[PDB]
Structures are given as C-alpha cells and as structure tokens.
Nucleic acid binder design. Structure first.
Ligand SMILES: [Mg+2]
Ligand SMILES: [Mg+2]
Ligand SMILES: [Mg+2]
Ligand SMILES: [Mg+2]
Ligand SMILES: [Mg+2]
Ligand SMILES: [Mg+2]
Ligand SMILES: [Mg+2]
Ligand SMILES: [Mg+2]
Ligand SMILES: [Mg+2]
Ligand SMILES: [Mg+2]
Ligand SMILES: [Mg+2]
Ligand SMILES: [Mg+2]
Ligand SMILES: [Mg+2]
Ligand SMILES: [Mg+2]
Ligand SMILES: [Mg+2]
Ligand SMILES: [Mg+2]
Ligand SMILES: [Mg+2]
Ligand SMILES: [Mg+2]
Ligand SMILES: [Mg+2]
Ligand SMILES: [Mg+2]
Ligand SMILES: [Mg+2]
Ligand SMILES: [Mg+2]
Ligand SMILES: [Mg+2]
Ligand SMILES: [Mg+2]
Ligand SMILES: [Mg+2]
Ligand SMILES: [Mg+2]
Ligand SMILES: [Mg+2]
Ligand SMILES: [Mg+2]
Ligand SMILES: [Mg+2]
Ligand SMILES: [Mg+2]
Ligand SMILES: [Mg+2]
Ligand SMILES: [Mg+2]
Ligand SMILES: [Mg+2]
Ligand SMILES: [Mg+2]
Ligand SMILES: [Mg+2]
Ligand SMILES: [Mg+2]
Ligand SMILES: [Mg+2]
Ligand SMILES: [Mg+2]
Ligand SMILES: [Mg+2]
Ligand SMILES: [Mg+2]
Ligand SMILES: [Mg+2]
Ligand SMILES: [Mg+2]
Ligand SMILES: [Mg+2]
Ligand SMILES: [Mg+2]
Ligand SMILES: [Mg+2]
Ligand SMILES: [Mg+2]
Ligand SMILES: [Mg+2]
Ligand SMILES: [Mg+2]
Ligand SMILES: [Mg+2]
Ligand SMILES: [Mg+2]
Ligand SMILES: [Mg+2]
Ligand SMILES: [Mg+2]
Ligand SMILES: [Mg+2]
Ligand SMILES: [Mg+2]
Ligand SMILES: [Mg+2]
Ligand SMILES: [Mg+2]
Ligand SMILES: [Mg+2]
Ligand SMILES: [Mg+2]
Ligand SMILES: [Mg+2]
Ligand SMILES: [Mg+2]
Ligand SMILES: [Mg+2]
Ligand SMILES: [Mg+2]
Ligand SMILES: [Mg+2]
Ligand SMILES: [Mg+2]
Ligand SMILES: [Mg+2]
Ligand SMILES: [Mg+2]
Ligand SMILES: [Mg+2]
Ligand SMILES: [Mg+2]
Ligand SMILES: [Mg+2]
Ligand SMILES: [Mg+2]
Ligand SMILES: [Mg+2]
Lengths: 88, 145, 190
RNA sequence: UAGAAGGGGGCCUGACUGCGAGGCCUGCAAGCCGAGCAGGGGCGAAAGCCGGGCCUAGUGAACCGGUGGUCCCGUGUGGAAG
RNA sequence: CUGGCGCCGGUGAAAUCCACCCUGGCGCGGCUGGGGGCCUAACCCUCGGAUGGGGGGACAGCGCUUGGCGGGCAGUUUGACU
RNA sequence: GCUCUCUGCGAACUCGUAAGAGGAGGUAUAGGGAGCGACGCUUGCCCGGUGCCGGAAGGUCAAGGGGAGGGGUGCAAGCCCC
RNA sequence: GGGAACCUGGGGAACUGAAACAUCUCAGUACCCAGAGGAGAGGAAAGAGAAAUCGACUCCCUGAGUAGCGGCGAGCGAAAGG
RNA sequence: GCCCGGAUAGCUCAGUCGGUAGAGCAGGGGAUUGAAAAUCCCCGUGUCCUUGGUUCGAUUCCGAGUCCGGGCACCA
C-alpha cells in the first residue's frame, strides 16, 4: 500500500486442494486463484517534532533508531527525508 | 524490551536499572513520558559512563577523607585562648578552630563541617570529629596566655 | 553423585536396611516382571540363611551341611498341616505336584537348586546369597542390600539389582532411582 | 451322464510351487483347453488319478493408492526418506 | 519413640520405624491456559485552529493465517441407442 | 394506501481495492429492502420439511495450545522427525 | 516529452489443446504500465556438483527431446560437462 | 479404514478405586372401584458376551475374540 523503510507487497496465488494427503492415498487440487498479500502496514507518530510514518510494523523499531539521531535541525514542517533518508 | 529507568517505579524503580518491559509499554508510556530509555548499547554503555565516572568521583571525597584522617587523628592544635582558669573570655568557634589551624599548619577545615554544636567557652583538652561519613577525630589543646 | 555414593549412608543399629527403590514402568503389551532366582550378586552378606530343603527322610545329614540351618522331609508334609501356625523354601523339581502341602495353608515358594546326588557339597554355591523381588502392581522395584560394612563394595546394587534390566517389553523408560532404607534414602543416576 | 458326472463311506487338502509342447477362438487386448518335465506331496496293493467344483454365467484395462514380503535402486559416503 | 516392642492367637496379607510407590484430596511454587471488572497512553470519533480537552479503548479497524456460509458472481457439465 | 422487515448514527444499504462518496448537512412521525395496491367488508387452520429470529447447556468442529508415546540418526551429549 | 523494432521491470487474459471439462494447456504469450539506451540485461561465487575437479557474465553449437515434470493425460522440459 | 461407549432380569438402563447383583416398566396374585384409570401391597427370573490370565477369590482388573451402538476421513 506503501512501505516506508522496508518495501511493498507481493501478489500470491492459491490452493484449493480436496484430498487424502499422500499418507493414505493421493491428493488433488481444485483451483489456483490470484491472491494479493497486502504488506501488514500500520502507522506511527513520533517526537522528532510531530512526525508520522507508516512503518511496515515489523520494522516499527527502526522508527525509533531513526529518531535516536539528533541530526541537528530545527523546523521544516516535515524533516522526514533527512530522517527517512539520511537514514540508510 | 530491555530499558533503563529514570524515575523510580514500582517493581522496577532504581533508576539506571535495566529492566525488561512489554514492547508496547516501553513504546507508548515509559518512553513517551521520558520515564525510561531503550537499553541500546549506545545508551547502555553511556550509562556505564555515568556509573563508573561517578562511582569513583564520589568515592573521591572518600579517598581524601582517609588520606586526611591519618593526620588530624594524631595531630592536635592547641589554642592560645586568652582565658582565666575555667571560663574563657571569647568562646572559640570553628572559624578560629579552623583559622588558628589553617594559618597554623596550612590545612583547610570547614567552619561548619567540623561537626561542632557550640563554640565551647571553657579551656581544656578537647577532641572531636570532622564530617561527613567516616570521621577523623581532630583534637584541640587550648592553653592560656 | 557420578555413579553412586555407597558411603553416603553415614545412626541406628546394623544398617543392613539398604535397598534399591528406583522406579519402573508398567508392562508393554502382553507382559510383566520376574526377578532372577538367586540373582548371583558379587556379595555374600555373611548371612546364615535358613534355607529349607523339600527333601525326604533320606537327605538328613547333608541337606543341613550345605548352607542350610535345618531341613525337613516328608514326615512334616501333612504333620504340620493340623495348625495355621505349624506351617527359605525349595520344591520337588520336575512335574511333581509339591503343591499339595504348599498349595494351601500362600507365602513364597517356587523354583530351586537341583542336584540328585546330594543336598550338600563343595559345589553348593548360589543357595544362600541373593534372592528375588518382582512386580509390586503399584510399582515393583524395592530390592535388598548389604549393610554399613563396605566402601565401593556395596556398589553391587549396580551390575546386579540395576543390571536386573533384562526382562521387559517396550512402552516407557525403566527408571527413577533411589537407594537406602530404615533411616532415609538418597538417589543418583543408574 | 447310471459301463456315473448320481447316493454313501475311509483316509486327505493337487482350491500346490517352477513351467509349459501344441492348439481353440480372435482386429487389437482379452478368454479357453492343455500333454509333458522338475520339485516336494495325497489316495490306491497296483495300473493310476490329483494344478478345485458334469460343463458352459457368478465379472472390470490402465492410472492412483493401501497392506505386506524381498536378491534390486537409493543423488559426494554410510543410514535413512522414497 | 524417649514408651510404642514385633511376632501375638488368628487373618489371603501384620502392625515400632524407614522407603519407593498405587487412589483421591489439600497447600505453597515453575511454566502454560480460560473467564469478570478498573484504568489510558496506543489505535478511532469528535472539540470556537489542540505541543491539547472531551468520548470510545486494547475492543473496534487493519495485516497474516483458520474453518464456515455463500447463484451475489464466474467457469462448466448435464451419455448413447431410438 | 396497508403490512412485514432491517437500521441508535462512524445507521442500515449502494458504489469504490482504497481514500471517499451517496444515505443526509437526515436521526425511527426518519432511511433501506420486500409484497399488496384508492376506498368498503374481510383476510380462517397448519411450524412436520425450508428460511429467519432466539437459545452463555450439551454433540461435532480447523488452525493453534498440549505433549503420553514412538521413529531416523550419531560414540555421545544432541540435532531431526511423526 | 518523442522514438520502427529490440531490452528490463511491474501487472497480466481468453479463444484454443486435452477430440466434453474443472488440474493442466495456450502462456508468463496478447495487451497495459514504468524505465533504460545505442543497446538493455547480466556479471566476479554464501556458485556448480562428484570430477585428486571447475573457476564472473552473456551469445552460438552440443549435451538433449536426455534428466525429469505430468488428471504419469494432452503435453512441458533442464543443468553439469564439451 | 482409524478414535470413542458398549454386551447385566422379558424390556429399557444402573454399580464398590475386587467381597450382595440392583432400579423403572411390562407380567402375574390381592385390596379399593358405577365404569376405566391412577394409587396401595408381595413377589417372580441372572453363566453380569466368549475365552484365558491377574488375585485367596473378580459384575468389576488386564490381555484377546465375536456381535451392537456412536464419531471422523478416504474412495483408484
Ligand atoms: Mg476429498
Ligand atoms: Mg517480528
Ligand atoms: Mg539518519
Ligand atoms: Mg537497513
Ligand atoms: Mg488356628
Ligand atoms: Mg507406577
Ligand atoms: Mg469323500
Ligand atoms: Mg490372439
Ligand atoms: Mg461351478
Ligand atoms: Mg463331484
Ligand atoms: Mg488418468
Ligand atoms: Mg489420478
Ligand atoms: Mg546428498
Ligand atoms: Mg546418500
Ligand atoms: Mg503391638
Ligand atoms: Mg519419593
Ligand atoms: Mg501413586
Ligand atoms: Mg483412575
Ligand atoms: Mg487445592
Ligand atoms: Mg487456599
Ligand atoms: Mg476515559
Ligand atoms: Mg482522547
Ligand atoms: Mg484488535
Ligand atoms: Mg451459472
Ligand atoms: Mg473454456
Ligand atoms: Mg460427462
Ligand atoms: Mg439422440
Ligand atoms: Mg450532506
Ligand atoms: Mg420502511
Ligand atoms: Mg420502503
Ligand atoms: Mg399487483
Ligand atoms: Mg363483517
Ligand atoms: Mg377450519
Ligand atoms: Mg409450517
Ligand atoms: Mg419449529
Ligand atoms: Mg443465536
Ligand atoms: Mg493440534
Ligand atoms: Mg501439534
Ligand atoms: Mg535420539
Ligand atoms: Mg526519455
Ligand atoms: Mg487461464
Ligand atoms: Mg481455458
Ligand atoms: Mg478442448
Ligand atoms: Mg465444450
Ligand atoms: Mg553497436
Ligand atoms: Mg551494455
Ligand atoms: Mg548490474
Ligand atoms: Mg547434486
Ligand atoms: Mg543450450
Ligand atoms: Mg510451459
Ligand atoms: Mg545449457
Ligand atoms: Mg471403506
Ligand atoms: Mg473403557
Ligand atoms: Mg457397562
Ligand atoms: Mg442389551
Ligand atoms: Mg455389566
Ligand atoms: Mg438388556
Ligand atoms: Mg434409556
Ligand atoms: Mg414409576
Ligand atoms: Mg407402570
Ligand atoms: Mg406395576
Ligand atoms: Mg398397564
Ligand atoms: Mg402375563
Ligand atoms: Mg400371557
Ligand atoms: Mg395412563
Ligand atoms: Mg399401571
Ligand atoms: Mg431368584
Ligand atoms: Mg440372565
Ligand atoms: Mg461368567
Ligand atoms: Mg449364578
Ligand atoms: Mg468402499
């Protein structure tokens, strides 16, 4: 949907199998349909000033580490690029 | 979540105490209210700093209170207090028990730290104790003339 | 400790009250237990076992001088039968039904030593040393032991009561050691 | 078909293992008969008969699996998984 | 033990005391689980423009995963002889 | 015009992947869905089967929790598996 | 912003084939979108695979319709090595 | 094909962490009753499925066998 640090979201398939297991008798497959795995997003408000990121919430922590950096710069309204960028 | 507390808390109070909390708690209370920080090597070691640095810097007035006691313990001043038998004429205050000392040997003494309750005012052989913590009993030999 | 600490048994009287109480495991499938009759044992205990010989009126000279205190014959079969207090223990080998005066008035009695030459001899070994201790329904184990007179000698409980591990199917793990008695009891790896 | 394939009785388990000349039938693939050799057996004194049932219906390719078994294979080697 | 011995006489089986243990229960501890309340700080809604004040509140919402309902929609199948 | 029914408001319902919009700058004397169809007189019996609503019990139930017990290996601790 | 094809990435059909059809096939094709440039891509081993071995990558010829994959159907189809 | 419970009086079902076999109903004998019920009394009958084994002995405890009833998954 976005990603911030991390990155985007794949597009998985499917498996409708109706069968034994291969540990009794065979096991056939009903249908493959195109699924879409959205990237478990989630939002973060942070103190750098009054900032907001949309961390892939598996990296939420990275938000802070990135906050744990006093790059020495007053207002700019966003000051995210530096953050989200002078990042790594 | 390993974090270092600042303000004293219940079940986890002693500041600088590294304690493990709920990710959430750390994130949305302790940390936001600045009651603690992320036990990150950065801060963690920087903590150790304020640890030793002061763990000895305060153990300083402890190394000198011992390299002091070994002298005022054996040394007595002896004040030339102008008096007559018992009652003195002008009680001897610490400032004198200090002045007549610093300007008699060259040693510095707090006209308050000496741990004195009253300027005496009566000749004799007085022995006391300096301050703070471990004490060093300095004595005074007030004579006449 | 490590293996055992026989010396660890350091009050009372002659502490012969030593035992093997390590746990066990029920019977896997169709099975049970059974202690090897007179389990060899690297000791003798210095016991004057009152070994009984199911002899007759002919074996009354050696059946006594073979390691037994006293021995009776067949003039006590249905003689010590008119009292519930009148009656070791061997048995007439073969298919002989010794279970005539032994099938009624319940104790301990089964297989024994064989020798159709004489009840006594110089080769009369194993017949006053060790015995048995089988299934207890609740949990068998519970064996015997010497007394407070031996260092690593008392460590017979090992390759003996411990090596008893010979009869058993499979449906668990025969273990949970514990040795001693009449005072208290410790325990260590078997 | 009683000059027994029918009715009864005594012992049995050939309602075997390895095979299979030569044919019947036939588009294929199937189905059917089968003397004889070997092994180790049954019944009979013996000659002999015995690879189910007087005979023709009582049945279903492959694929996919399941239970066993075994000389085989088993991804660098050994063992396993298969 | 610091005053019961222990066989008793009988009973399938004998008592002191030590054990390991079967049955069931109780009492503190480890580690995992359920249900009830209270709160706020995330999240959500609002508030003469709030570094905030109200309301809701770990629920909702949303991500991943489970199973179910499911002509709302889709792809299809619905034999031959005659 | 009558009846049944959903909807307490960030309404239900519709469109859209979403943001958001319509509903409605409305608030149950309002919105949505359904059937009948001015008005008059009326609208019987049947909850077996289907649907819907209600039932903090039971039955069955997927992940997941749980690990009795077993297996593959190594000299082993172990690592792995059911 | 533009450019005949060619190129990389992100998305991504059906008809057909299977003599029906759903897995499978057509096919990662058609097309849509972003981007690159005279090319684009790839590229200095967390490689290959049995060789006391080889030594970035790409292209061609073989290897090979082999190994395998597959309602073990229709059909799909490598890599090492040279 | 796996996982559960079972087999006890004619019938429907109980139960000790081994010691007797018991309820409800049907059925028969009696009282009461306008009639028919409901009440009220006394019983009647057992290889506790079949085998072993456990124990001094077993409805029971365990192995195994057959019939019976419930639950779940496959089906070339
Ligand atoms: Mg199925
Ligand atoms: Mg994580
Ligand atoms: Mg940075
Ligand atoms: Mg990074
Ligand atoms: Mg008597
Ligand atoms: Mg036990
Ligand atoms: Mg015959
Ligand atoms: Mg032919
Ligand atoms: Mg026939
Ligand atoms: Mg015949
Ligand atoms: Mg097929
Ligand atoms: Mg198939
Ligand atoms: Mg390998
Ligand atoms: Mg191998
Ligand atoms: Mg007594
Ligand atoms: Mg214990
Ligand atoms: Mg127990
Ligand atoms: Mg129990
Ligand atoms: Mg309790
Ligand atoms: Mg309590
Ligand atoms: Mg509140
Ligand atoms: Mg608020
Ligand atoms: Mg939630
Ligand atoms: Mg349709
Ligand atoms: Mg089609
Ligand atoms: Mg069809
Ligand atoms: Mg037709
Ligand atoms: Mg409006
Ligand atoms: Mg309405
Ligand atoms: Mg309407
Ligand atoms: Mg109409
Ligand atoms: Mg009327
Ligand atoms: Mg009517
Ligand atoms: Mg109805
Ligand atoms: Mg109803
Ligand atoms: Mg309900
Ligand atoms: Mg589970
Ligand atoms: Mg599990
Ligand atoms: Mg192992
Ligand atoms: Mg351009
Ligand atoms: Mg397609
Ligand atoms: Mg198609
Ligand atoms: Mg087709
Ligand atoms: Mg068609
Ligand atoms: Mg060129
Ligand atoms: Mg180039
Ligand atoms: Mg490159
Ligand atoms: Mg290989
Ligand atoms: Mg090639
Ligand atoms: Mg292909
Ligand atoms: Mg090639
Ligand atoms: Mg079946
Ligand atoms: Mg049971
Ligand atoms: Mg029962
Ligand atoms: Mg019955
Ligand atoms: Mg019963
Ligand atoms: Mg019955
Ligand atoms: Mg009933
Ligand atoms: Mg009744
Ligand atoms: Mg009745
Ligand atoms: Mg009656
Ligand atoms: Mg009646
Ligand atoms: Mg009758
Ligand atoms: Mg009758
Ligand atoms: Mg009635
Ligand atoms: Mg009646
Ligand atoms: Mg009777
Ligand atoms: Mg009966
Ligand atoms: Mg019986
Ligand atoms: Mg009887
Ligand atoms: Mg079937």
């Amino acid at each position: 949907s976005g990603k911030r640090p991390i990155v985007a979201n794949s597009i998985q398939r499917r498996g409708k199998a109706k069968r034994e297991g291969g540990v009794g008798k065979k096991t056939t497959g009903i249908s493959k349909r195109r699924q879409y795995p959205n990237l478990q997003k989630v939002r973060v408000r942070v103190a750098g000033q009054e900032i907001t990121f949309r961390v892939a919430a598996s990296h939420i922590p990275k938000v802070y580490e990135l906050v744990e950096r006093a790059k020495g710069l007053k207002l700019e309204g966003l000051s995210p690029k530096e953050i989200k960028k002078e990042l790594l | 979540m390993k974090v270092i507390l600042l303000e004293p808390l219940e079940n986890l109070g002693d500041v600088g105490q590294v304690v493990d909390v709920k990710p959430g708690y750390a994130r949305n209370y302790l940390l936001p209210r600045g009651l603690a920080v992320l036990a990150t090597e950065s801060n963690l070691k920087a903590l150790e700093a304020r640890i030793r640095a002061q763990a000895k810097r305060l153990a300083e007035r402890k190394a000198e209170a011992e390299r002091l006691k070994e002298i005022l313990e054996n040394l007595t001043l002896t004040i030339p207090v102008r008096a007559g038998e018992t009652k003195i004429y002008g009680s001897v205050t610490a400032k004198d028990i200090a002045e007549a000392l610093s300007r008699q040997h060259g040693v510095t003494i707090d006209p308050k730290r000496l741990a004195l309750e009253k300027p005496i005012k009566e000749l004799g052989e007085y022995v006391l104790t300096y301050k703070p913590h471990p004490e060093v009993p300095i004595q005074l030999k007030v004579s006449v003339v | 400790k490590v293996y055992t600490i026989d010396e660890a048994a350091r009050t009372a009287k002659f502490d012969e009250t030593v035992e093997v109480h390590a746990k066990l495991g029920i019977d896997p499938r169709r099975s049970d237990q059974n202690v090897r009759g007179t389990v060899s044992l690297p000791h003798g205990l210095g016991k004057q076992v009152r070994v009984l010989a199911i002899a007759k009126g002919e074996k009354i000279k050696e059946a006594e001088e073979a390691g037994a205190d006293y021995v009776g014959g067949e003039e006590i079969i249905q003689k010590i039968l008119d009292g519930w207090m009148d009656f070791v223990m061997g048995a007439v080998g073969s298919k002989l039904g010794r279970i005539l005066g032994p099938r009624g008035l319940n104790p301990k009695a089964g297989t024994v030593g064989f020798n159709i030459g004489e009840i006594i001899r110089e080769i009369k070994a194993g017949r006053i040393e060790f015995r048995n201790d089988k299934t207890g329904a609740i949990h068998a184990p519970v064996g015997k032991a010497s007394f407070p007179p031996e260092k690593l000698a008392d460590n017979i409980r090992a390759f003996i009561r411990a090596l008893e591990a010979h009869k058993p199917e499979g449906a668990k793990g025969t273990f949970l050691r514990s040795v001693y008695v009449t005072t208290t009891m410790g325990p260590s790896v078997r």
